[PDB]
Write a protein that binds this ligand. Structure first.
Ligand SMILES: *[C@@](C)(CO)[C@](*)(O)[C@H](CC(C)C)NC(=O)[C@H](Cc1ccccc1)NC(=O)[C@H](CC(C)C)NC(=O)[C@H](CCc1ccccc1)NC(=O)CN1CCOCC1
Ligand SMILES: [Mg+2]
Lengths: 231, 212, 240, 233, 235, 244, 222, 195
């Protein structure tokens, strides 16, 4: 009310309203799902269009050969954060000849988002990210929120009506976690998960967007006729 | 290097060799020393290979940006001055460039500008630049007239490079010819000195110093 | 440094600071530009609440940017000096690098660009000035007349007016100016410019300034007596 | 622009079937003066890497601090700091190699020659060289300073190419290293008798040996040598 | 007052949303993409009859293979075009090739959100960026001040956008010829424009692989307008 | 942040006016009146000191009239402190010109630059404008004798006779009435004093409440002299014109 | 005074065929009269069917290759995974080299691959960025020994048709991958014999439309 | 760049400047104009380091032309010379100084007098009846000391100038390919085409 003019102001109950309004931008965004087993990690994203004449907004971005994310909310803010991740992954390779740990990737994003919530003039990032990767400690899935909070999970979903897919994964937890050495089945579980967040619309060939990374699989994105298999 | 370009009745002739040296080591015999900036503008290259090659391709980008912004092809004077003002900023840093900006526009007509790395910029009808420039001057000056035909002018430019290619140790390889008219530049082929020298010697009856 | 975003959008999609800068232009003394077949004429109003003035030394309303281009304006006088100075510097800088004087379009584009930069730069307000830029391109005999405004938009005009009561004089020019046949001579172009100002001014004494620009850097300012002859001629023909 | 003041001489090393061996004497020379005798020039990083450094000792001590700080930094927010996400020899080397080249590019080098010896997580032997110029190279045997001229020839008789590595045991490899250290004591004027030796094995891990001495030296034949030509007495 | 980069309770940037209202006040611009080329057309909208309409430059060349149309506060587009042209030429200098239409659009859209308390406010202009490259062929992009860009088969921006967009929905198909697309832009422009459409108050342009980006003459457009009127009366 | 406390000094009103400039002019309208009158053979500067106290040291005082160089002087109306900042800048600018061209600065060039500085404070920087209006009186070999005025907006204009500060409306009417072009300095001196005497808010105009200065060519042959009047010299000129 | 440059020796060789291109280089690394390594590769697969080698001062060479490899990576990110053509790579390398015009990379750089028509391509650079496409180029310590032999055998220079009175030249033709590798191996064995900085091993990288293949051969170790 | 001369007579200033541009063992051009018009009644000739000369001359030209537009008034030769001197005086203590020597010939319209100023690259200004830069002075000064009179006409000044050029052509080592002569007077600047 009087305490939402900027990010530098606390409310009487100890809330940061600008950070909360940034969180609201994610809820308006199109749904995206993340899940992993022990061998592979998968991102599934429902892309959104302006109208029938327009293209479908790309949700998934590659950061390195072994890491990448999906976005929900302000896409330009995802471009800034993904670019930062690309540089940090790259710094780790050039300087230490070392693939960046997915956990450090999360810590770095947390710290970058935080600085924008404590200073005058700036604003919080208006996007939520699901980071997947495969490093020296196996497969990983992270959920980034622009408050700064980063959380490692087996599976999750963010965006509009993400609660449906999140409930499904909470039921399916014991099943999909053990899908080891089988990419297509892990994707199927993710495609069935995102389907619990659909209303009136269904998954079409230029609507669905899938990405995967794993033990002997570089981070690759599938769009167009390459996802027709999973409909 | 040896490069020349002269102005005449039928426009501009531009001729250059194709040798690159690193001391006495002949590094290449097939270097393109003419840069094609646009259908109406040419640039010759002598001195430091990288300096010339880098900054004249950069010049072409600046000429493209001019015609986008101004909806009109850049003048030869303006183009040459962009390059001369650039190298002047680097004066003393050790750039080595002896270039000639040749072209045609409506307002200027056929125009040649000599531009070098110590900031000199000169408009003129005849210029020879490079380690064998004096050898090219010798033949070019003694045979030059304004009323040369397009056929005779092309040959004189070719013959002048050949003269330098022969005498100057750091010149040779092959001759590249260009003719610039009101309609733009026209390429007139690559001519290897290996075959061209003997062809010229036999037909012209010159080069009597050499064992035939 | 002072960073405040002064020019910003409002809910209805307007930038009030830019629009309020236009109100400052509307307050300013009237300025008119009319281009003929072989010339352009810049007319300017001077308010007559100021007597005891020294017209020798008082800044003139029309300013030379180069020997071939002139700039008149309406709005804040102090603001206009800053634009004129920048334009004059850019004119000499163009001659130095391109070895050719500016076109009227280029000079207008530069001035307009400066005005625009002040509409989305932090810590500054927009120029409370609209300009009429007129002249002839190098080695060209086609007359040029451009207009700029605080927002930064610019465009070419066969004839145009800016300042206070400009909507009245624009109304006059819209019916009196023929596109198919513009003022064929200098006299015809000056007369139409004076006529248009006489719809608004008050008296044709020391209230009207006229400046004529012709090809190949031929610019001259008319004196009181010269202008008064046009005023005397128009009034006698009016009584009919 | 520097000049080295207090210096350390040769660092020698080689690969064997299960790991790597590295050695360097304990001397800190001050020109011709053999100033400091208790200087450790082999610095372990974790339980799987040993960095041997020659050249300027002040710059060596700077590098020690950097490596020490690198271990601390790696431990931050890293639950697997003593497991999967522990520091590898290849990580430690590439970091140093980056620093060495950056410093030479700023015309202010760390006046050193460095050999990073270790064993990777997958069991592979790691042995690579880097110096003040940022120049890097790897080989079955690596040595700095006089070691390059005198040790390498001896160590290459044992492991002349890649295929000789599995055929070379830790006993044979250490024997060659210790012999090389004796030869350097005979012939390098800025060397000492006391030295340190480190073995990094993929099975038995890191073994760091201090206070070793050159022994079994041949000096007896000196008594027979009289004069410089003619002299009989 | 309030911060420039502030979020509303609904999760949108106030200034970005307000700049969109400015774009709705702007003159209409329409783009249609075909397999034979991309067509760009705009409403000039002269504020007075004395204004020489040919000086109204709302269609613009970025490179030989990329063109651009604008709508809204058109003065704001000048620095965007300048950036686009430099980006296009710079990429040619670094890589000896034409730059992808999408990469060009992304470069322009990076400027969009570089405002706050960088420039003082968002751009008050939308752009239709049309072009061709070897990889993705003929393309049409809509670049907003939000930093977002969508690819479109056809798109209208400006005051008559929602009415024109609904018309483009019905009329567009994947087998449209270039000539058919030209007439379709003129047809839809004439429907949404206030004043009567002619060669002086409306401008056409196109980009083809063969001839590159070309703005049409008033003589050429006039014939297409005459051809359009005859075809509508023919049934 | 700090946005809350920003007055926004450099913005337009809905009517297209600069708030701070208008309010600065309102401030100046309460300052002691200053008059400049330009004659054919010289210039007069007259100014009324702000409600003087009897214990004020009058002879070693400078409030209204300041010297910029040997050929140019100014009369001040508004905040004195603000004026002195601008005066020192103007003095430096005149010396820069002399150093560069080996010629005394033309009056208008000095006036323009000082007025450009004032303009800057209205368009950028976020600072309050200078609450000062000047009357410039000076000579050069191009235009001869010149009078200018500048105000917080940074706009300047040339004059034959002009008043700034308080009661300018009434003062300008009186000057417009009795001024003529073939006027001499001695006549202009009389006009300046008579005008102040009628427009003053004081009971009677006295020597101790005035500052006076002339710029004549009254020196020996083709050279300009600046005379800043002493208290006794003002007392004499006041008696000589029959005011006291 | 500190000297930031050094000479790591070695030599490299690039030949272009009709539908292939090879880039060879010896594996010896040296300083002064000492051998540092008998196998230290300096020919690298950089992706997009581009092979590269920067011979001379190894530290600068490694830095350059590292930076170009990184340039390829970012080219994919910024331009929708578009394949970097050999001609585009060459121009990009010029800007890398010239970027340090006043503190140069002391290296002779050669890249090889296929042009956009599928034909073999070799580009060669000087230390400050001047570049040229060629059928043939040797670089490094033994370049002066190898290059004239290549002129004679690859481009058939100074060879005339027998019996034609030195009037008709020997006609130019593309060589097979088999014939090219013969010339590479003979060039390096000859260079090894007469140059002290060349020897130990030879590593050849062959580039066709199918990918990048490797071949290794022993060289004299003296 | 080598020979630049200047002679102030009764009613005009005459500037003579060599036409040769030499680089190495080659005369690249023999028709070079080593002068710029700063204003309608002010002309500056120049000589010195390659590149610097023209860059400096044009920079001064632009500044004077900017002044003329701003004030709608022509600066006096004295004022222009002082401005030029200051620029050179700044330059000499810069990171890379302009190595340019100049002569400024002008006609002061207010005084109705011709004026010749000699300024070297250090910023050393002198007003003179006759001036030269470089090795030219070592011949011409003694010659002008003898033959020069203050009340000479423009035609007498040209004959006096011909005498200098002849002496230089006789005793100078280098071939400077003759001179371009320009006259500055009350009617402005004009070039003598046949010299
Ligand atoms: C005639 C043909 C010869 O003088 C012309 O003047 C030509 C102009 C053409 C090439 C555009 N000039 C040259 O051929 C020119 C001569 C030269 C040499 C060095 C400096 C300036 C001018 N040659 C070059 O520039 C060569 C190009 C080679 C053939 C690839 N390059 C070099 O000499 C390079 C880079 C020079 C350089 C300049 C500034 C800073 C650093 C380097 N130098 C080396 O290759 C060094 N060297 C060669 C042998 O291998 C071991 C190291
Ligand atoms: Mg050998």
């Amino acid at each position: 009310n009087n305490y939402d003019g900027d990010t530098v102001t606390f409310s009487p109950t100890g809330r940061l309203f600008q950070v909360e309004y940034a969180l609201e931008a994610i809820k308006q965004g199109s749904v995206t799902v993340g899940l992993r087993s022990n061998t592979h990690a998968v991102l599934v994203a429902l892309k959104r269009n302006a109208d029938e004449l327009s293209s479908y907004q790309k949700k998934i971005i590659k950061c390195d050969e072994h890491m990448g994310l999906s976005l929900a909310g302000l896409a330009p803010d995802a471009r800034v954060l993904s670019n930062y991740l690309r540089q940090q992954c790259n710094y780790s390779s050039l300087v230490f000849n070392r693939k960046l740990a997915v956990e450090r990737a999360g810590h770095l994003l947390c710290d970058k988002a935080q600085k924008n919530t404590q200073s005058y003039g700036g604003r919080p990032y208006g996007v939520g990210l699901l980071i997947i990767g495969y490093d020296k400690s196996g497969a990983h899935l992270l959920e980034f929120q622009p408050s700064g909070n980063v959380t490692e999970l087996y599976g999750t979903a963010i965006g509009a009506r993400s609660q449906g897919a999140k409930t499904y994964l909470e039921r399916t937890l014991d099943t999909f976690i053990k899908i080891d050495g089988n990419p297509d089945e892990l994707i199927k579980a993710g495609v069935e998960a995102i389907s619990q967040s659909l209303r009136d619309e269904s998954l079409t060939v230029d609507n669905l967007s899938i990405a995967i990374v794993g033990k002997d699989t570089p981070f690759t994105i599938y769009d167009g006729e390459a996802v027709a298999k999973y409909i | 290097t040896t490069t020349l370009a002269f102005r005449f009745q039928g426009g501009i002739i531009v001729a250059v060799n194709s040798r690159a040296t690193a001391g006495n080591w002949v590094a290449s015999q097939t270097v393109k020393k003419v840069i094609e900036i646009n259908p109406f503008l040419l640039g010759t290259m002598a001195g430091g290979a990288a300096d010339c090659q880098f900054w004249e391709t950069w010049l072409g980008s600046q000429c493209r940006l001019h015609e986008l912004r101004e909806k009109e092809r850049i003048s030869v004077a303006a183009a040459s001055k962009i390059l001369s003002n650039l190298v002047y900023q680097y004066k003393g840093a050790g750039l080595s460039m002896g270039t000639m900006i040749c072209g045609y526009t409506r307002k200027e007509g056929p125009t040649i500008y000599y531009v070098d790395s110590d900031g000199t910029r000169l408009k003129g009808d005849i210029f020879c630049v490079g380690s064998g420039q004096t050898f090219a001057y010798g033949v070019l000056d003694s045979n030059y007239k304004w009323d040369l035909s397009v056929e005779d002018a092309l040959y004189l430019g070719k013959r002048s490079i050949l003269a330098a290619a022969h005498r100057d140790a750091y010149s040779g390889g092959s001759v590249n010819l260009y003719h610039v008219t009101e309609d733009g530049w026209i390429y007139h082929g690559n001519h290897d000195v290996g075959e061209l020298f003997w062809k010229v010697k036999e037909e012209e009856g010159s080069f009597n110093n050499v064992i035939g | 440094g002072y960073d405040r975003a002064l020019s910003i959008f409002s809910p209805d999609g307007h930038i009030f600071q830019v629009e309020y800068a236009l109100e400052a232009v509307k307050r300013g003394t009237c300025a008119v530009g009319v281009k003929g077949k072989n010339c352009v004429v810049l007319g300017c109003e001077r308010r007559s609440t100021l007597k005891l003035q020294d017209t020798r030394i008082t800044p003139s309303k029309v300013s030379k940017i180069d020997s071939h281009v002139v700039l008149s304006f309406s709005g804040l006088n102090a603001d206009s000096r800053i634009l004129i100075e920048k334009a004059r510097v850019e004119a000499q800088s163009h001659r130095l690098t391109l070895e050719d004087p500016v076109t009227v379009e280029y000079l207008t584009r530069y001035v307009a660009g400066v005005q625009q930069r002040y509409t989305q730069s932090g810590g500054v307000r927009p120029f409370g000035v609209s300009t009429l830029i007129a002249g002839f391109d190098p080695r060209d005999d086609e007359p040029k007349l451009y207009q700029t405004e605080p927002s930064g938009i610019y465009s070419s005009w066969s004839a145009q007016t800016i300042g206070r009561n400009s909507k009245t004089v624009r109304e006059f020019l819209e019916k009196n100016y023929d596109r198919k046949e513009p003022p064929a001579t200098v006299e015809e172009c000056v007369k139409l410019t004076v006529r248009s100002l006489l719809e608004v001014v008050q008296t044709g004494a020391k209230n009207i300034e006229i400046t004529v620009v012709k090809p190949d850097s031929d610019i001259v300012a008319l004196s009181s007596e010269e202008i008064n002859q046009y005023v005397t001629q128009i009034e006698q023909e009016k009584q009919e | 622009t520097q000049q080295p003041i207090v210096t350390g001489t040769s660092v020698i090393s080689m690969k064997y079937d299960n790991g790597v061996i590295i050695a360097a004497d304990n001397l800190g020379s001050y020109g011709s003066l053999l100033r400091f005798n208790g200087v450790e020039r082999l610095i372990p990083v974790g339980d799987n890497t040993v960095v041997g450094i020659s050249g300027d000792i002040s710059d060596m001590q700077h590098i020690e601090r950097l490596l020490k700080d690198l271990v601390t930094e790696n431990a931050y927010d890293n639950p697997l700091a003593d497991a999967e996400e522990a520091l590898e020899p290849s990580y430690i080397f590439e970091y140093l190699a980056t620093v060495m080249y950056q410093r030479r590019s700023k015309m202010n080098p760390l006046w050193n020659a460095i050999i990073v010896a270790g064993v990777q997580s997958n069991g592979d032997q790691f042995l690579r060289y880097v110096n003040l110029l940022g120049v890097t190279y790897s080989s079955p045997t690596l040595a700095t300073g006089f070691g390059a001229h005198m040790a390498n020839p001896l160590l290459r008789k044992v492991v002349d190419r890649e295929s000789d590595i599995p055929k070379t045991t830790v006993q044979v490899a250490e024997e060659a290293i210790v012999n090389a250290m004796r030869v350097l004591y005979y012939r390098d004027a800025r060397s000492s008798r006391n030295f340190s030796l480190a073995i990094i094995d993929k099975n038995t891990g890191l073994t760091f040996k201090k206070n070793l001495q050159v022994e079994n030296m041949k000096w007896d034949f000196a008594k027979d040598i009289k004069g410089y030509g003619t002299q009989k007495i | 007052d309030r911060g420039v980069s502030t979020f509303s309770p609904e999760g949108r940037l106030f200034q970005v949303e307000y700049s969109l209202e400015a774009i709705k006040l702007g003159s209409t611009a329409i783009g249609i993409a075909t397999k034979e080329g991309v067509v760009l057309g705009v409403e000039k909208r002269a504020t007075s009859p004395l204004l020489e309409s040919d000086s109204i430059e709302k269609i613009v060349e970025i490179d030989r293979h990329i063109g651009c149309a604008m709508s809204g506060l058109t003065a704001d587009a000048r620095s965007m075009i300048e950036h686009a042209r430099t980006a296009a030429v710079t990429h040619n200098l670094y890589y000896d090739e034409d730059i992808n239409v999408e990469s060009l659009t992304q470069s322009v859209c990076d400027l969009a959100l570089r405002f706050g308390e960088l420039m003082s406010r968002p751009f008050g202009v939308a752009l239709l960026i049309a072009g061709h490259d070897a990889d993705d062929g003929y393309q049409l992009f809509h670049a907003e001040p939000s930093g977002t860009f969508y690819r479109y088969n056809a798109k209208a921006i400006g005051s008559g956008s929602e009415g024109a967009q609904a018309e483009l929905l019905n009329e567009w198909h994947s087998s449209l010829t270039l000539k058919e697309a030209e007439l379709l832009v003129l047809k839809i422009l004439k429907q949404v424009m206030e004043e009567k459409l002619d060669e002086n108050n409306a401008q056409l342009s196109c980009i083809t692989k063969q001839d590159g980006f070309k703005i049409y003459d008033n003589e050429k457009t006039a014939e297409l307008i005459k051809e359009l009127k005859e075809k509508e009366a023919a049934e | 942040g700090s946005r809350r406390y920003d007055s926004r000094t450099t913005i337009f009103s809905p009517e297209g006016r600069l708030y701070q400039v208008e309010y600065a002019l309102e401030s100046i309208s309460h300052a002691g009146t200053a008059i400049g009158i330009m004659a054919s053979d010289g210039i007069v500067l007259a100014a009324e000191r702000k409600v003087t106290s009897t214990l004020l040291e009058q002879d070693t005082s400078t409030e209204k009239l300041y010297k910029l160089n040997d050929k140019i002087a100014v009369a001040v109306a508004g905040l004195t402190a603000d004026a002195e900042i601008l005066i020192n800048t103007a003095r430096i600018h005149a010396q820069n010109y002399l150093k560069t061209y080996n010629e005394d600065i033309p009056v208008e060039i000095l006036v323009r630059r000082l007025s450009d500085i004032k303009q800057g404070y209205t368009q950028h920087g976020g600072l309050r404008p200078f609450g000062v209006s000047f009357i410039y009186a000076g000579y050069d070999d191009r235009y001869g004798y010149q009078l200018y005025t500048s105000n917080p907006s940074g706009n300047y204009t040339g004059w034959k006779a002009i008043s700034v500060g308080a009661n300018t409306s009434a003062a300008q009417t009186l000057l417009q009435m009795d001024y003529k072009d073939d006027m001499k300095v001695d006549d202009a001196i009389e006009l300046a004093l008579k005008t102040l005497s009628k427009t003053t808010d004081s009971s009677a105009l006295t020597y101790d409440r005035l500052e006076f200065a002339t710029i004549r060519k009254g020196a020996n042959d083709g050279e300009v002299y600046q005379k800043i009047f002493k208290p006794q010299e003002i007392k004499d000129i006041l008696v000589k014109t029959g005011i006291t | 005074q500190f000297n930031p440059y050094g000479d790591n020796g070695g030599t490299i060789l690039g030949i272009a065929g009709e539908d292939f291109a090879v880039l060879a280089g010896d594996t010896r690394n040296i300083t002064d009269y000492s051998i540092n390594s008998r196998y230290e590769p300096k020919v690298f697969d950089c992706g997009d069917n581009i092979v590269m080698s920067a011979n001379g001062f190894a530290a600068d060479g490694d830095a350059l290759v590292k930076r170009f490899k990184n340039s390829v990576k970012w080219y994919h990110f910024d331009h929708n995974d578009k394949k970097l053509s050999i001609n585009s790579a060459a121009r990009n390398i010029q800007h890398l080299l010239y970027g340090k015009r006043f503190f140069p990379y002391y290296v002779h750089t050669i890249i090889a691959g296929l042009d956009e028509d599928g034909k073999g391509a070799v580009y060669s650079f000087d230390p400050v960025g001047s570049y040229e496409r060629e059928q043939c180029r040797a670089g490094g310590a033994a370049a002066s020994l190898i290059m004239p032999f290549l002129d004679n055998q690859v481009n058939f220079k100074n060879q005339y048709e027998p019996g034609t009175n030195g009037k008709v030249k020997k006609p130019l033709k593309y060589l097979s991958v088999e014939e090219v590798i013969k010339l590479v191996r003979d060039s390096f064995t000859s260079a090894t014999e007469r140059h002290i900085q060349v020897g130990d091993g030879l590593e050849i990288l062959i580039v066709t439309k199918d990918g990048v293949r490797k071949e290794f051969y022993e060289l004299k170790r003296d | 760049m080598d020979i630049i001369l200047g002679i102030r007579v009764q009613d005009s200033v005459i500037l003579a400047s060599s036409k040769a541009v030499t680089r190495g063992i080659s005369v690249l051009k023999d028709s070079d104009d080593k002068t710029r018009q700063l204003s309608p009644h002010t002309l500056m000739s120049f000589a010195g380091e390659a590149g610097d000369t023209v860059q400096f001359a044009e920079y001064i030209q632009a500044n004077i032309q900017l002044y003329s537009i701003r004030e709608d008034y022509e600066l006096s030769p004295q004022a222009v010379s002082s401005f030029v001197r200051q620029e050179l005086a700044k330059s000499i203590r810069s990171r890379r100084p302009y190595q340019v020597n100049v002569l400024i010939g002008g006609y002061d319209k207010k005084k109705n007098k011709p004026e010749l100023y000699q300024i070297d690259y250090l910023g050393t200004k002198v007003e003179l009846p006759y001036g030269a830069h470089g090795y030219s002075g070592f011949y011409t000064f003694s010659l002008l000391d003898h033959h020069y009179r203050p009340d000479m006409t423009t035609e007498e000044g040209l004959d006096l100038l011909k005498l200098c050029v002849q002496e230089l052509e006789k005793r100078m080592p280098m071939d400077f390919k003759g001179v371009i002569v320009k006259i500055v007077d009350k009617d402005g600047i004009r070039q003598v085409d046949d010299f």
